[PDB]
Amino acid sequence: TDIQMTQSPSSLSASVGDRVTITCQASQDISNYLIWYQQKPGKAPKLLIYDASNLETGVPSRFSGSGSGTDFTFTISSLQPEDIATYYCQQYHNLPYTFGPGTKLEIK
Amino acid sequence: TDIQMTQSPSSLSASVGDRVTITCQASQDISNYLIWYQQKPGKAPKLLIYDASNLETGVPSRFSGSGSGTDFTFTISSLQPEDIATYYCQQYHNLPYTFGPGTKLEIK
Numbered sequence: 531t532d533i534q535m536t537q538s539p540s541s542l543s544a545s546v547g548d549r550v551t552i553t554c555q556a557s558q559d560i561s562n563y564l565i566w567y568q569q570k571p572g573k574a575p576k577l578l579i580y581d582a583s584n585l586e587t588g589v590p591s592r593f594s595g596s597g598s599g600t601d602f603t604f605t606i607s608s609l610q611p612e613d614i615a616t617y618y619c620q621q622y623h624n625l626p627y628t629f630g631p632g633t634k635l636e637i638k
Numbered sequence: 639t640d641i642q643m644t645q646s647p648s649s650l651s652a653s654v655g656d657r658v659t660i661t662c663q664a665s666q667d668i669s670n671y672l673i674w675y676q677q678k679p680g681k682a683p684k685l686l687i688y689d690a691s692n693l694e695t696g697v698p699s700r701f702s703g704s705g706s707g708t709d710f711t712f713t714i715s716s717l718q719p720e721d722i723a724t725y726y727c728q729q730y731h732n733l734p735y736t737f738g739p740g741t742k743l744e745i746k
Contacts, residue, residue: 565735574726574737575683586734587640618682622735626694627673629682 533558537619537630543638550606552633554597554619562598563623569632570615579604611637641666641729645738651746658714660741662705662727670706671731677740678723686725687712719745 534557544550554564562582567575577586579595582602592607606613614637619630642665652658662672670690675683687693687703690710700715714721722745727738 574740577734577736580733580735622730625688626685627688627730628685631682 532626533560533621533624533628535619535621535628535630537633539633540631541634541636543636544609546609546611546637548609550609550613550635552604552606552617552635554602554604554630556600556602556621559599560621560623563621564595564597564602565620565622566593566595566604567618567620568613568615569618575618606635609635609637640734641668641732641736643727643729643736643738645727645741647741648739649742649744651744652717654717654719654745656717658717658743660712660725660743662710662712662738664708664710664729667707668729668731671729672703672705672710673728673730674703674712675726675728676721676723677726683726717743717745 536555538553564582565577566579568578569575578589578593579585582597583595594605596603616632616634618632621628644663646661672690673685674687676686677683685694686697686701690705691703702713704711724740724742726740729736
């Protein structure tokens with residue numbers, strides 16, 4: 531039914547080159563039907579990861595995703611200036627498809 | 639493969655109580671696998687319409703969606719202040735699940 535997607539942290543600031551680790555928790559088992567989107571300010575979300583851990587074409591290798599079941603992790607190995615954005619997870623296991631509340635990542 | 643989602647208009651301003659009609663064209667036939675989301679400023683997208691024309695529960699009746707194939711329409715029958723948001727279409731016919739580029743709706 532109404533699957534609730536939780537996401538932590540809500541916001542964070544870091545330096546160029548740091549490792550960033552973001553979580554997304556589902557309120558019910560969603561198997562590996564988890565997407566991660568990047569939404570730069572004023573733009574649409576851009577799919578980065580599907581099936582929990584698969585990167586789409588053209589996505590820089592610094593992005594990775596992991597998890598399965600109810601707990602998921604998105605990692606940026608080396609934060610870059612172009613990564614300033616809000617990141618969202620989304621499950622596509624069951625309609626309606628639901629979003630986490632976002633993680634706003636900034637530099638400094 | 640890479641389905642392109644086009645959305646028009648890019649931005650628009652209107653008054654409280656007006657009818658608003660926004661369109662979304664897909665670059666390939668997606669049957670009726672089209673979602674419409676509402677994203678209020680600072681928040682995550684929230685699903686309003688699925689299967690091109692089906693409204694989710696709790697969605698105000700002023701919202702509607704239509705279309706099938708390659709052309710889709712989202713309509714607000716009577717614009718309200720709480721409707722200031724960016725609206726996005728999204729296809730879920732084939733991964734990756736591509737987004738429209740957004741329609742920014744403002745009052746005044």
